mmCIF file of C-alpha atoms in Angstrom:
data_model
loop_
_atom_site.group_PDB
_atom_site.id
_atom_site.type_symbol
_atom_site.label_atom_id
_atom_site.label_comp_id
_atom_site.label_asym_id
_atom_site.label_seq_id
_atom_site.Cartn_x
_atom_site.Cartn_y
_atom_site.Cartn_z
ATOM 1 C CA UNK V 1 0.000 0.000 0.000
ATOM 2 C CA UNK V 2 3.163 1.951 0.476
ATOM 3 C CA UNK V 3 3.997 2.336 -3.410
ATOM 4 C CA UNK V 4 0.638 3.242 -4.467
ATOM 5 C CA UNK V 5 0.192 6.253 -1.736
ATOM 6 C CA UNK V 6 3.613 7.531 -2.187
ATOM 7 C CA UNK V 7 2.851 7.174 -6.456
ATOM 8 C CA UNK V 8 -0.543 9.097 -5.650
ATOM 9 C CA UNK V 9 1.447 11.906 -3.557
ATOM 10 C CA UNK V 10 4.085 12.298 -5.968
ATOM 11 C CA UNK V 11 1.549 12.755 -8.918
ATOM 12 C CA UNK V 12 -0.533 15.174 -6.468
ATOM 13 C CA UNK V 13 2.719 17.491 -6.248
ATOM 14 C CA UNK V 14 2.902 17.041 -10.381
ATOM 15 C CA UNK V 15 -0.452 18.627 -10.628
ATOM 16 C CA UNK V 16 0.206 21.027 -8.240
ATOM 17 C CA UNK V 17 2.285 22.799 -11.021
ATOM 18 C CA UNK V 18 0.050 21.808 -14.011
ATOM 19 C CA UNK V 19 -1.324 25.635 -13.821
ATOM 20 C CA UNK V 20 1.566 27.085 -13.167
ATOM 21 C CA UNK V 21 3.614 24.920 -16.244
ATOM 22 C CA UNK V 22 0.605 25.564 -18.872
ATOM 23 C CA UNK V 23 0.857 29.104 -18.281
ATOM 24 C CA UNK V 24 4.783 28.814 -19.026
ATOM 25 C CA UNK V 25 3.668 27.130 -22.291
ATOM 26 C CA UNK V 26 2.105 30.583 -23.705
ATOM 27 C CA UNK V 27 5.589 31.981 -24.942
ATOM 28 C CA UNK V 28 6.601 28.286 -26.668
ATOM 29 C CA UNK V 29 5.256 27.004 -30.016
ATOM 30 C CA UNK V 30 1.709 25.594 -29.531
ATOM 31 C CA UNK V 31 2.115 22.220 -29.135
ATOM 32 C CA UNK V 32 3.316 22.619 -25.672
ATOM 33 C CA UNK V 33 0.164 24.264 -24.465
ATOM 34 C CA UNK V 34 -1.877 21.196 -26.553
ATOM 35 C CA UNK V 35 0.105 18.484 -25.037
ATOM 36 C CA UNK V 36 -0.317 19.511 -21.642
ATOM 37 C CA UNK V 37 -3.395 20.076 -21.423
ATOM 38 C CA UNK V 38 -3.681 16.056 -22.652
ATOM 39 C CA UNK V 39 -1.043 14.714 -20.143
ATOM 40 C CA UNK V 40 -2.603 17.092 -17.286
ATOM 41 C CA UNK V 41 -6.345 15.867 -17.824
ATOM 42 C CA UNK V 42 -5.078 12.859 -18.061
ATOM 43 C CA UNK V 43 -2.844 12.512 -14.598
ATOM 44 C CA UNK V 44 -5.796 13.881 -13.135
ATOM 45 C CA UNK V 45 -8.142 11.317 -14.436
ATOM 46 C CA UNK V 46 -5.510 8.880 -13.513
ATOM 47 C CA UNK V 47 -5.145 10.393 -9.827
ATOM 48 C CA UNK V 48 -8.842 10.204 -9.089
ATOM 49 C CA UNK V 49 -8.924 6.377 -10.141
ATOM 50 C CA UNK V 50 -6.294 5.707 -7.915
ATOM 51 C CA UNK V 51 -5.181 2.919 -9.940
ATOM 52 C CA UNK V 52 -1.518 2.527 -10.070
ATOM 53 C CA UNK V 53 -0.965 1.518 -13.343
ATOM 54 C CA UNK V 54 -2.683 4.410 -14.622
ATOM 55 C CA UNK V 55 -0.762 6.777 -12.044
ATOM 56 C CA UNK V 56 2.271 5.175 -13.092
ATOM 57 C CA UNK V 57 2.102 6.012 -16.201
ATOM 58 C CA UNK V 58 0.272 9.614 -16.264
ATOM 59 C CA UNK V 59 3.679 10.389 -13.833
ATOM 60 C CA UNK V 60 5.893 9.725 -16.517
ATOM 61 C CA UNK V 61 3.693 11.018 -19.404
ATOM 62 C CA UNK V 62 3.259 14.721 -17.257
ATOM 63 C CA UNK V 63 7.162 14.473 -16.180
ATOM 64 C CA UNK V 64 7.947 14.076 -19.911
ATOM 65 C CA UNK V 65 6.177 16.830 -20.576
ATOM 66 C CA UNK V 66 6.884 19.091 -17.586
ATOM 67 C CA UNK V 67 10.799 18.462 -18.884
ATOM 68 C CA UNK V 68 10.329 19.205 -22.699
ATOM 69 C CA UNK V 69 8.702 22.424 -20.965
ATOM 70 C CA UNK V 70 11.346 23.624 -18.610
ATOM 71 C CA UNK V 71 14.074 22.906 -21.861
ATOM 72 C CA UNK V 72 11.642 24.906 -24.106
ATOM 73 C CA UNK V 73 12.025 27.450 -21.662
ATOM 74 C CA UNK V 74 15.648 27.941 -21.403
#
């Protein structure tokens, strides 16, 4: 039960900067903006369901994102 709380916390703190990181996306080419906006509703979806297959992998979908983002940015 250990893995699938700390997965659910950890993709909690993701979203917690899903505003903040699709905001960033205004001054990049639009397909930032589009993408995150799929990998966001998605994580939340995913957090909701509480499944951890489907947490698992809407981490690492929003954490591929959230990086193309903060490289975009430099």
């Amino acid at each position: 039960e250990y893995q699938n709380e700390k997965l659910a916390n950890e993709l909690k703190s993701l979203l917690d900067e899903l505003n903040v990181n699709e905001l960033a996306t205004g001054s990049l080419n639009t397909y930032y903006k589009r993408t995150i906006k799929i990998s966001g509703q998605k994580a939340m979806y995913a957090l909701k369901s509480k499944d951890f297959k489907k947490m698992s992998e809407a981490k690492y979908q929003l954490q591929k994102i959230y990086n193309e983002i903060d490289e975009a940015l430099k």
